[PDB]
Scaffold this active site. Structure first.
Site, PDB file in Angstrom:
ATOM      1  N   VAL A 125      47.090  42.227  42.209  1.00  0.00           N
ATOM      2  CA  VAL A 125      45.712  42.539  42.598  1.00  0.00           C
ATOM      3  C   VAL A 125      45.823  43.648  43.586  1.00  0.00           C
ATOM      4  N   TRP A 126      45.102  44.711  43.310  1.00  0.00           N
ATOM      5  CA  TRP A 126      45.059  45.832  44.203  1.00  0.00           C
ATOM      6  C   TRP A 126      44.220  45.479  45.452  1.00  0.00           C
ATOM      7  N   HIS A 166      56.359  52.855  44.023  1.00  0.00           N
ATOM      8  CA  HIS A 166      55.397  53.948  43.868  1.00  0.00           C
ATOM      9  C   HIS A 166      55.487  54.762  45.140  1.00  0.00           C
ATOM     10  N   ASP A 200      33.115  30.777  21.370  1.00  0.00           N
ATOM     11  CA  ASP A 200      32.530  30.243  20.129  1.00  0.00           C
ATOM     12  C   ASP A 200      33.582  29.984  19.082  1.00  0.00           C
ATOM     13  N   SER A 202      53.117  44.182  50.045  1.00  0.00           N
ATOM     14  CA  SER A 202      52.528  45.442  49.684  1.00  0.00           C
ATOM     15  C   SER A 202      51.319  45.704  50.588  1.00  0.00           C
ATOM     16  N   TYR A 253      30.273  25.684  13.252  1.00  0.00           N
ATOM     17  CA  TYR A 253      30.341  26.708  14.257  1.00  0.00           C
ATOM     18  C   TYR A 253      29.722  26.117  15.537  1.00  0.00           C
ATOM     19  N   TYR A 270      46.819  61.081  44.289  1.00  0.00           N
ATOM     20  CA  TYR A 270      45.606  60.802  45.063  1.00  0.00           C
ATOM     21  C   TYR A 270      45.890  61.087  46.505  1.00  0.00           C
ATOM     22  N   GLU A 281      37.535  31.476   3.506  1.00  0.00           N
ATOM     23  CA  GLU A 281      38.786  31.612   4.217  1.00  0.00           C
ATOM     24  C   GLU A 281      39.756  30.674   3.507  1.00  0.00           C
ATOM     25  N   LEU A 282      40.902  31.237   3.165  1.00  0.00           N
ATOM     26  CA  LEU A 282      41.915  30.550   2.401  1.00  0.00           C
ATOM     27  C   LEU A 282      43.171  30.399   3.298  1.00  0.00           C
TER      28      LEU A 282
HETATM   29  C1  LIG Z   1      52.862  49.900  47.409  1.00  0.00           C
HETATM   30  C2  LIG Z   1      51.519  50.532  47.284  1.00  0.00           C
HETATM   31  C3  LIG Z   1      50.445  49.697  46.978  1.00  0.00           C
HETATM   32  C4  LIG Z   1      49.185  50.233  46.973  1.00  0.00           C
HETATM   33  C5  LIG Z   1      49.028  51.580  47.285  1.00  0.00           C
HETATM   34  C6  LIG Z   1      50.115  52.421  47.576  1.00  0.00           C
HETATM   35  C7  LIG Z   1      51.384  51.886  47.571  1.00  0.00           C
HETATM   36  C8  LIG Z   1      52.613  52.730  47.833  1.00  0.00           C
HETATM   37  N1  LIG Z   1      47.761  52.120  47.246  1.00  0.00           N
HETATM   38  C9  LIG Z   1      46.658  51.312  47.017  1.00  0.00           C
HETATM   39  C10 LIG Z   1      45.394  51.895  47.109  1.00  0.00           C
HETATM   40  O1  LIG Z   1      45.286  53.009  47.728  1.00  0.00           O
HETATM   41  N2  LIG Z   1      44.296  51.131  46.821  1.00  0.00           N
HETATM   42  C11 LIG Z   1      44.459  49.803  46.445  1.00  0.00           C
HETATM   43  O2  LIG Z   1      43.451  49.159  46.127  1.00  0.00           O
HETATM   44  N3  LIG Z   1      45.709  49.216  46.407  1.00  0.00           N
HETATM   45  C12 LIG Z   1      46.832  49.983  46.697  1.00  0.00           C
HETATM   46  N4  LIG Z   1      48.102  49.451  46.656  1.00  0.00           N
HETATM   47  C13 LIG Z   1      48.324  48.085  46.022  1.00  0.00           C
HETATM   48  C14 LIG Z   1      48.200  46.963  47.074  1.00  0.00           C
HETATM   49  O3  LIG Z   1      49.041  47.300  48.162  1.00  0.00           O
HETATM   50  C15 LIG Z   1      48.584  45.575  46.531  1.00  0.00           C
HETATM   51  O4  LIG Z   1      48.137  45.412  45.190  1.00  0.00           O
HETATM   52  C16 LIG Z   1      47.991  44.462  47.370  1.00  0.00           C
HETATM   53  O5  LIG Z   1      48.346  44.723  48.701  1.00  0.00           O
HETATM   54  C17 LIG Z   1      48.749  43.170  47.108  1.00  0.00           C
HETATM   55  O6  LIG Z   1      48.164  42.176  47.866  1.00  0.00           O
HETATM   56  P1  LIG Z   1      48.783  40.698  47.857  1.00  0.00           P
HETATM   57  O7  LIG Z   1      48.085  39.929  48.976  1.00  0.00           O
HETATM   58  O8  LIG Z   1      48.646  40.182  46.462  1.00  0.00           O
HETATM   59  O9  LIG Z   1      50.433  40.792  48.006  1.00  0.00           O
HETATM   60  P2  LIG Z   1      51.327  41.055  49.275  1.00  0.00           P
HETATM   61  O10 LIG Z   1      50.510  41.908  50.260  1.00  0.00           O
HETATM   62  O11 LIG Z   1      52.571  41.633  48.744  1.00  0.00           O
HETATM   63  O12 LIG Z   1      51.522  39.605  49.921  1.00  0.00           O
HETATM   64  C18 LIG Z   1      52.287  38.663  49.207  1.00  0.00           C
HETATM   65  C19 LIG Z   1      52.933  37.847  50.364  1.00  0.00           C
HETATM   66  O13 LIG Z   1      53.693  36.765  49.831  1.00  0.00           O
HETATM   67  C20 LIG Z   1      54.713  36.456  50.716  1.00  0.00           C
HETATM   68  N5  LIG Z   1      55.745  35.727  49.970  1.00  0.00           N
HETATM   69  C21 LIG Z   1      56.301  36.103  48.774  1.00  0.00           C
HETATM   70  N6  LIG Z   1      57.203  35.149  48.417  1.00  0.00           N
HETATM   71  C22 LIG Z   1      57.207  34.153  49.342  1.00  0.00           C
HETATM   72  C23 LIG Z   1      57.933  32.974  49.514  1.00  0.00           C
HETATM   73  N7  LIG Z   1      58.846  32.533  48.675  1.00  0.00           N
HETATM   74  N8  LIG Z   1      57.662  32.154  50.583  1.00  0.00           N
HETATM   75  C24 LIG Z   1      56.727  32.550  51.516  1.00  0.00           C
HETATM   76  N9  LIG Z   1      56.029  33.715  51.345  1.00  0.00           N
HETATM   77  C25 LIG Z   1      56.268  34.506  50.300  1.00  0.00           C
HETATM   78  C26 LIG Z   1      55.168  37.869  51.102  1.00  0.00           C
HETATM   79  O14 LIG Z   1      55.990  37.940  52.231  1.00  0.00           O
HETATM   80  C27 LIG Z   1      53.879  38.694  51.219  1.00  0.00           C
HETATM   81  O15 LIG Z   1      53.415  38.896  52.553  1.00  0.00           O
HETATM   82  N1  LIG Z   2      36.986  29.666  10.980  1.00  0.00           N
HETATM   83  C1  LIG Z   2      36.657  30.755  11.757  1.00  0.00           C
HETATM   84  N2  LIG Z   2      36.661  30.535  13.077  1.00  0.00           N
HETATM   85  C2  LIG Z   2      36.387  31.513  13.951  1.00  0.00           C
HETATM   86  C3  LIG Z   2      36.036  32.845  13.493  1.00  0.00           C
HETATM   87  C4  LIG Z   2      36.007  33.036  12.010  1.00  0.00           C
HETATM   88  O1  LIG Z   2      35.680  34.165  11.542  1.00  0.00           O
HETATM   89  N3  LIG Z   2      36.318  31.973  11.211  1.00  0.00           N
HETATM   90  N4  LIG Z   2      35.767  33.834  14.509  1.00  0.00           N
HETATM   91  C5  LIG Z   2      35.968  35.059  14.214  1.00  0.00           C
HETATM   92  O2  LIG Z   2      35.891  36.013  14.974  1.00  0.00           O
HETATM   93  C6  LIG Z   2      35.366  33.464  15.883  1.00  0.00           C
HETATM   94  C7  LIG Z   2      33.981  32.800  15.834  1.00  0.00           C
HETATM   95  N5  LIG Z   2      32.913  33.721  15.564  1.00  0.00           N
HETATM   96  C8  LIG Z   2      32.016  33.486  14.590  1.00  0.00           C
HETATM   97  C9  LIG Z   2      30.686  33.924  14.748  1.00  0.00           C
HETATM   98  C10 LIG Z   2      29.715  33.633  13.764  1.00  0.00           C
HETATM   99  C11 LIG Z   2      30.104  32.963  12.603  1.00  0.00           C
HETATM  100  C12 LIG Z   2      29.096  32.560  11.532  1.00  0.00           C
HETATM  101  O3  LIG Z   2      29.417  32.250  10.384  1.00  0.00           O
HETATM  102  N6  LIG Z   2      27.826  32.422  11.926  1.00  0.00           N
HETATM  103  C13 LIG Z   2      26.797  31.854  11.094  1.00  0.00           C
HETATM  104  C14 LIG Z   2      26.903  30.352  11.283  1.00  0.00           C
HETATM  105  C15 LIG Z   2      26.014  29.628  10.294  1.00  0.00           C
HETATM  106  C16 LIG Z   2      25.840  28.140  10.578  1.00  0.00           C
HETATM  107  O4  LIG Z   2      26.487  27.506  11.569  1.00  0.00           O
HETATM  108  O5  LIG Z   2      25.088  27.502   9.841  1.00  0.00           O
HETATM  109  C17 LIG Z   2      25.495  32.397  11.629  1.00  0.00           C
HETATM  110  O6  LIG Z   2      25.449  32.775  12.904  1.00  0.00           O
HETATM  111  O7  LIG Z   2      24.490  32.522  10.940  1.00  0.00           O
HETATM  112  C18 LIG Z   2      31.440  32.556  12.450  1.00  0.00           C
HETATM  113  C19 LIG Z   2      32.383  32.780  13.444  1.00  0.00           C
HETATM  114  C20 LIG Z   2      36.363  32.364  16.292  1.00  0.00           C
HETATM  115  N7  LIG Z   2      36.417  31.327  15.289  1.00  0.00           N
END
Ligand SMILES: *Cc1cc2c(cc1C)nc1c(=O)[nH]c(=O)nc-1n2C[C@H](O)[C@H](O)[C@H](O)COP(=O)(O)OP(=O)(O)OC[C@H]1O[C@@H](n2cnc3c(N)ncnc32)[C@H](O)[C@@H]1O
Ligand SMILES: Nc1nc2c(c(=O)[nH]1)N(C=O)[C@@H](CNc1ccc(C(=O)N[C@@H](CCC(=O)O)C(=O)O)cc1)CN2
Ligand SMILES: *Cc1cc2c(cc1C)nc1c(=O)[nH]c(=O)nc-1n2C[C@H](O)[C@H](O)[C@H](O)COP(=O)(O)OP(=O)(O)OC[C@H]1O[C@@H](n2cnc3c(N)ncnc32)[C@H](O)[C@@H]1O
Ligand SMILES: Nc1nc2c(c(=O)[nH]1)N(C=O)[C@@H](CNc1ccc(C(=O)N[C@@H](CCC(=O)O)C(=O)O)cc1)CN2
Ligand code: NA
Ligand code: NA
Lengths: 827, 827, 104
Positions: free
Chosen positions: A357-358, A222, A549, A42, A536, A256, A655-656
């Site tokens: 990735v563009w 495209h 967290d 690309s 926590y 574009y 929480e149950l």
């Molecule tokens: C198609 C397109 C894309 C595009 C765009 C308009 C068109 C029509 N306009 C853009 C824009 O204006 N602005 C922008 O930021 N991006 C735009 N794009 C997207 C962009 O072209 C792509 O996202 C970007 O070029 C992709 O880059 P990447 O480096 O990831 O990929 P690639 O260029 O396709 O290179 C991949 C290479 O891998 C080699 N290959 C694949 N398989 C193998 C195997 N098995 N063995 C060895 N080599 C392999 C490929 O040959 C290729 O060169």
């Molecule tokens: N079991 C459980 N895990 C979880 C969540 C949850 O709600 N329950 N979360 C849900 O999104 C995220 C964690 N986020 C959380 C943020 C704050 C508190 C909390 O109770 N804070 C108290 C801790 C008190 C203490 O340690 O003594 C505080 O900040 O005062 C809990 C979870 C991911 N993990």
């Protein structure tokens, strides 16, 4: 340094070679199946428009870095960036409003831009027929990349630093041993490697299948068209590919534009999605690849372009005096959520991807990947780019196909951050789903899970609600995917008792004789406590950044249940446990299971929670039966349950958890017990607002690896006294008080202007932060927003939050806003 | 030999001491908190009626052994059994019909008995007012046990053989180390032990809590009353406790009777269930225990007895000239399903239970336990007695309380073998439950799971069914919990495509580097095959008896999914895996998980299965995509699924497993795909009939540990060539052809007389077998029954099956009855 | 208040429903009301048809105001009505019986 093989000499793989070299890693072989002079992916056909401004902070920093690098990438006094600026025009009121939001992103992410009036648009871009132009967004630092030229100059400077390029070399497989990569297969035998990075663009999935790895991208075509010489343009630009006007976006018509000398290049997404089977492309003999004959370019289908060509002539009438000269259907990648795919595979140690990735983000992604490879972490948060963010249902070819096509269909649409897909829906549901439907659940989804945001049954409670709980009107934008019903659910949670579906919370079981040892090293807590304790705690990286967290509940000597944030955590635990097991004794083995899907959880919360549960359990739920942040096994409605006493909504209760087959009974027993107490089901809208009133942090927005625990106000959760844990050394001497940036709670002064997230925050007229999380607070009766702010900004200072171009006055307020003395949570 | 401590000197614990001694194990200490002369548990008050005949073969053999042993247990020329016979009378038509079924059990289990006419009842038991007597069942070998005397004579003869008895000694705890028992705690310090057997009667749960073990019995009180001297009885019996008439059952009024000299003893279950809190009993000082003052005897509540006393006077008018002399509410044990609780605990190695055992079965249970302890297995099938048969929801105090009370309420009722409880229901449901309800599922339950037996939606198919599929009328008994609808579901399964809910099938994940090693030793198959293989195989004991028939699917190098028969299997795997891990290296560790509750399975079966699934999957389901008895991962309706190609119903298709959260989507995708093919949901009635037409065996009825694989016709599944596996040595030289008993398929000649199970089978007028499994076969259009038969009985011989007193002619037929060449299952 | 012309009340709702109401709920009916009757405006089950719809039936984006109480799903229902077969609930249509010798 390690032997690295990069697959692909596109803009991604050659930037990655480059970013590794400058970091001292030059043992690199770069492979490409096309000729080095024009590899034919690309990158070989991209027109190179670069619009930096992006709803995503990371993507925006990737684009900013790409602009900087391409401008510095020069030979014979010609760089690889032509900085003509960029202009997006609005032809509808919806778009004009959205450009104001985008200007907000610009300021948030440190990109200079302005909104242009219709007249100023005409002055900048006189070719615009001004009649339907309502406004424009102008970013002077945007521009045109010369990506193919950048590839050639990256190849040359990396080659000189020792990097090996093998063009015309097709990867046919990947060699491995003991779960790590050891080489890359070609028809010419194996090329040894310690690290393989697949930079294979839209061939990503094909490469991925070689190690059993689902790479969720879809190749899609495209259309890109160049006109004949445009009369109005005669004499104005250097031939053959000069440009002087800003790159031009016409998002209301999926179009574009750029100049190529006196011709125009028109990019159109204004056509049906066009999936491409990469296995049908054919092996191009390298000697045959040329500008019009390359694997990335499919035959032009003029019929698809006709409507775009009409809209073009309407927007730029000068083009009506040209014709279509050449078009092609160019292939690139799309993904289910529009993010790229980066990081170490789950399947194979040392094997990484940097795909989908563009050109716009290329140098940025390369730099993050180089940091990842050489230091173990990226300096930029990769939460939305990590390949491991996806749930298993989101990795099927059918999911990837259907959602990636819809992302192509919507690529240029104005979309609310809560906008759900219509299909595929209902992939994962909790065991309470039929009951949620009876109660008129309004479901949104994430991770494949259907999640009620509120319940239509509870609309009947609005007439009974005390006026102090009634929120003001919402504008149309903050009112999308929102309901007054959430006020009632918040009200009942604060004053009666509510049942929340916690089933989608990532649930990991970490088990075995090495379980405590693994968790003691990964987390910031001392977990060597008798079972029953819930802690926590944080997971950090080696730079002290917050990866997550989590809660850790010790259910037995060798068994821990973690509540995590998603599948990046799962994958992190999986690998860390496999590595401890492989290099440990018979006492270090440890398994990690994601049991989310086989279990369920109700958060039973609010001041009547003990009254309710005591009707259906003879277990002791008093404070002396179960303390805050403790867990035990109980029986409720005849169902064995693990009860943990904590509450992300800030109220009494538990929480149950139980197994999926028991969940409906557990639900019905509680529901029935709760009738006299007014129990309700409560959804995510209330949940989010209530947890915000408590100041509880949400990983991924309120903090990422770009923040340390002290910046995030999570110092309490780091036990610095621990002998050893990942990140400890990095965090020596730091405190919350000394942090240059700190997460602050903001309340909005007017009591009514709701913000949603990403809005820039200004102190004394300078952009110093951005909204991480927000909601209307039903209890404090005002909009709340979180933002990092400079340490010098204090509680009680005033700041402005820009929402759709308008400054909203907010005050820095001490958190928690609600019950900071935890009176509702203790005894 | 090992140091054994028995807790309890009731009829169970002293028989167990005795049964161990005669087997050479005499290092036994027997503890009891009461005085040795009258320990004061339930044995100290039982009246000692012993009715051998029982729907359960094992229970019946336990009673037969108890009668034999008590008769041999003698001193001063007086045995501990008074063999007056037993008579059960019927006062309703329902009971009279049921006595005919019971006579069937008698012949099945080798107990001599006869049905008596009303006149013959009067001749045997002249005191009966004959007016409501419709008939009786008379078993001459039944009788009266002298259980308290048996305890004293067991104590004396075991004491002489070295056994130590400590009365007045209260167990207060159990000492353990490394997951095995090491001793029993008393206020007098620890008594070391290698093996502890809790024989603590209704104190079982209290003992169990000392090691964290749920012992699902409930103490319940039961009234027993002695009259004053009955005038009609004057001079007839030896005083004070003689008896000459058969023990008497009056099951229509919840009453039974015996003589005590010229008095009558009346046992009544004709009262409200009376749960007893064992913690409220008080510690009886041993010196205080006497016949009326013992922990097992609660105050008589005359008000509860009044109705029983009236019915008594009606049945035996002579009693109207006596009065109530003494009554008590005596405590004994009940269990959720009426079976005793035997075997090794899950929680603690070497710790066993033998609890909830009537005097009637005592010697039998003791002997099985002695065999278990000394040889590793019981000579009698313990499938219905093993403590580990229960599912987790069936072990909560509330489940045990509610169901054990209902078992008391129903103890003397006539009940169909499929009779469901009304409460507690809906404990466990699969993820298809709402959809099953939409389709009018008729649910029965087992293991806590709700299981459709058929679906009322499919009644609409009966008008379209070809007449050859229409079954004849059923009698009322075989028609209970049955529907003509099952014919239609069987029809559609054989000719279109059906979706069966396989979710309740016990599902175990065996995982880790020692997984293959564990399974290779436990099973009769060579499992060291590349992943993808599904193997049907057996688990045996060391005597070659069949503990289970299972499937093993190898999902990866270290990961196996087993489809098992229930929680005896789970517990068996759990312990075997823990033992391998503890005495193995870092390469032998292995975990076992029961994932039943967190997953689900649809059996998608019938000739249109491939047409259906191909609409919602791009995976290859052809024969070359997935062979019979192979598994692979596929995607169906966007859901990751593990597909295994086998079918317990004998048709094309697959078991489709997925996680619970995905199940409803997987269901709906298939349902919708199946509309054009006439898909139906099909339930357990059809499933059972179809699998019987295939000759597939059901563990627990068709074979138990009392059968070897060759007797059961499962030789194909034993790989005798394996170096090593449990049971191999025992099975050397055996073949199906040489087996003295073989499992035979019977078809019923008249095409219509359905049998249900347990009916005796006669060859040339001798009882030589008994129905193990049966169903109406919809495909062959006749009732089918399985029975073991002597090897001399051949295919084509004719046998009679007795059903409610009537001989039904059946022919021994070659199986499978349906598609024996597997044409429907292959390519 | 500023209110869209289709803005429903939240309460009282469900006063009058047709006999197809349970089936409408199974199919994810989005109900508005008038005259006390609950009336589906579209059915969430039919969102699954959008991926199959010919592009010519796909409507352009709507602004926020015209997009309130509206769904792309209605395009699919219109499509299927024009090309296959659809079942509309006409139950709320005022129905009067005029009867007797003076009716005509
Ligand atoms: C198609 C397109 C894309 C595009 C765009 C308009 C068109 C029509 N306009 C853009 C824009 O204006 N602005 C922008 O930021 N991006 C735009 N794009 C997207 C962009 O072209 C792509 O996202 C970007 O070029 C992709 O880059 P990447 O480096 O990831 O990929 P690639 O260029 O396709 O290179 C991949 C290479 O891998 C080699 N290959 C694949 N398989 C193998 C195997 N098995 N063995 C060895 N080599 C392999 C490929 O040959 C290729 O060169
Ligand atoms: N079991 C459980 N895990 C979880 C969540 C949850 O709600 N329950 N979360 C849900 O999104 C995220 C964690 N986020 C959380 C943020 C704050 C508190 C909390 O109770 N804070 C108290 C801790 C008190 C203490 O340690 O003594 C505080 O900040 O005062 C809990 C979870 C991911 N993990
Ligand atoms: C109550 C009853 C039972 C009964 C019956 C009529 C009544 C009113 N009629 C029966 C009948 O006619 N036919 C029949 O077969 N059974 C009948 N029964 C039932 C029968 O009595 C019991 O099922 C059987 O007796 C129980 O025997 P088991 O040996 O299991 O139990 P036990 O006699 O109660 O002895 C248990 C001993 O354990 C000692 N113990 C308990 N806890 C401890 C501690 N912590 N430490 C030391 N010792 C302990 C007890 O003291 C008791 O002796
Ligand atoms: N996966 C699975 N496991 C299960 C069952 C099941 O239906 N599926 N069972 C369900 O109750 C029990 C096992 N009973 C079964 C009895 C016979 C056959 C069967 O397919 N027999 C073929 C085997 C052919 C072969 O090995 O080549 C046969 O006897 O011809 C399967 C299961 C427990 N385990
Ligand atoms: Na579009
Ligand atoms: Na009863």
């Amino acid at each position: 340094t390690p032997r690295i093989v990069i697959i692909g000499a596109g803009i991604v793989g050659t930037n990655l070679a480059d970013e590794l070299v400058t970091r001292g890693w030059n043992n690199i072989t770069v492979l490409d199946q096309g000729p080095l002079n024009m590899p034919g992916g690309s990158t070989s056909h991209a027109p190179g428009l670069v619009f930096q401004t992006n709803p995503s902070k990371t993507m925006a920093s990737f684009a900013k870095y790409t602009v900087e690098k391409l401008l510095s990438l020069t030979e014979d006094g010609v760089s690889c960036f032509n900085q003509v600026g960029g202009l997006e025009v609005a032809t509808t009121e919806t778009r004009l409003a959205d450009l104001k939001r985008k200007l907000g992103y610009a300021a948030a992410w440190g990109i200079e831009g302005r909104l242009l009036s219709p007249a100023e648009c005409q002055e900048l871009y006189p070719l615009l027929d001004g009649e339907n132009i309502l406004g424009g967004l102008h970013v002077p630092s945007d521009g045109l990349a010369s990506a193919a030229r950048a590839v050639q100059l990256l190849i040359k400077r990396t080659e000189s630093a020792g990097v090996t390029y093998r063009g015309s070399t097709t990867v046919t497989g990947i060699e491995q041993s003991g779960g790590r990569v050891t080489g890359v297969q070609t028809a010419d035998g194996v090329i040894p490697a310690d690290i393989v990075v697949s930079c294979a663009g839209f061939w990503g999935a094909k490469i991925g299948a070689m190690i059993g790895m689902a790479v969720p991208l879809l190749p899609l075509a495209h259309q890109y068209v160049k006109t004949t010489p445009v009369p109005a343009q005669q004499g104005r630009n250097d031939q053959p590919n000069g440009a002087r006007l800003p790159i031009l976006r016409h998002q209301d018509q999926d179009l574009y534009y750029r100049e190529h000398g006196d011709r125009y290049g028109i990019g159109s997404y204004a056509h049906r999605p066009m999936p491409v089977d990469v296995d049908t492309l054919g092996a191009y003999a390298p000697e045959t690849v040329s500008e019009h004959h390359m694997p990335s370019r499919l035959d032009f289908t003029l019929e698809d372009f006709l409507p775009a060509w009409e809209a073009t002539k309407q927007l730029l009438p000068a083009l009506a005096d040209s014709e279509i000269e050449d078009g092609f259907n160019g292939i690139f990648s799309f993904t289910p959520d529009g993010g790229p795919l980066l990081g170490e595979s789950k399947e194979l140690d040392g094997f990484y991807v940097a795909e989908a990735v563009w050109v716009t983000h290329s140098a940025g992604v390369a730099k993050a990947m180089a940091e990842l490879l050489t230091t173990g972490r990226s300096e930029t948060d990769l939460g939305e780019c990590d390949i491991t963010r996806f749930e298993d249902v989101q990795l099927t070819p059918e999911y990837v196909s259907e959602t990636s096509q819809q992302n192509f269909v919507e690529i240029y649409d104005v979309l609310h951050p809560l906008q759900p897909r219509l299909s595929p829906r209902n992939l994962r549901v909790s065991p309470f789903h039929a009951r949620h439907k009876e109660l008129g659940a309004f479901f949104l989804e994430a991770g494949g899970w259907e999640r009620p945001y509120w319940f239509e049954a509870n609309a009947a409670l609005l007439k009974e609600m005390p006026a102090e709980w009634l929120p003001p009107a919402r504008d149309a934008w903050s009112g999308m995917f929102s309901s007054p019903i959430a006020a009632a659910e918040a009200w009942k949670t604060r004053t009666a008792v509510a049942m929340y579906d916690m089933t989608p919370l990532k649930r990991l079981e970490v088990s075995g004789p090495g379980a405590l040892k693994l968790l003691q090293e990964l987390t910031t807590a001392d977990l060597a406590k008798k079972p029953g304790a819930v802690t926590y705690t944080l997971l950090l990286d080696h730079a002290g950044g917050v990866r997550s967290d989590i809660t850790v509940a010790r259910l037995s000597e060798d068994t821990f249940q973690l509540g995590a944030n998603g599948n990046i955590d799962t994958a992190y635990f999986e690998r860390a446990a496999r590595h401890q097991t492989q290099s440990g004794s018979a006492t270090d083995w440890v398994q990690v299971r994601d049991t989310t899907g086989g279990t369920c959880c109700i958060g039973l919360w609010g001041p009547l929670a003990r009254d309710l549960v005591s009707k259906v359990s003879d277990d002791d739920f008093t404070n002396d039966g179960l303390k805050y942040f403790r867990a035990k096994n109980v029986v409720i409605g005849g169902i064995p349950v693990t009860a943990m006493r904590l509450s992300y909504v800030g109220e009494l209760g538990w929480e149950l958890y139980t197994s999926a087959d028991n969940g409906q009974r557990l639900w019905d027993a509680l529901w029935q017990a709760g009738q006299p107490f007014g129990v309700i089901a409560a959804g995510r809208a209330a949940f989010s607002s209530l947890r915000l009133e408590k100041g509880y942090r949400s990983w991924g927005t309120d903090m990422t690896t770009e923040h340390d625990p002290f910046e995030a106000g999570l110092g309490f959760a780091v036990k610095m006294a621990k002998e050893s844990f990942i990140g400890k050394g990095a965090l020596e001497g730091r405190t919350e008080e000394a942090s240059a940036r700190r997460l602050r709670c903001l309340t909005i002064d007017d009591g009514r202007s709701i913000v949603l997230g990403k809005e820039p925050v200004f102190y004394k007229e300078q952009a110093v932060g951005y909204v991480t999380s927000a909601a209307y607070g039903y209890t404090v009766a005002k909009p709340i927003a979180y933002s990092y702010l400079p340490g010098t900004v204090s509680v009680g200072d005033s700041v402005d939050i820009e929402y759709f171009g308008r400054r909203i006055t907010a005050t820095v307020t001490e958190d928690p806003l609600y019950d900071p003395k935890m009176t509702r949570l203790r005894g």
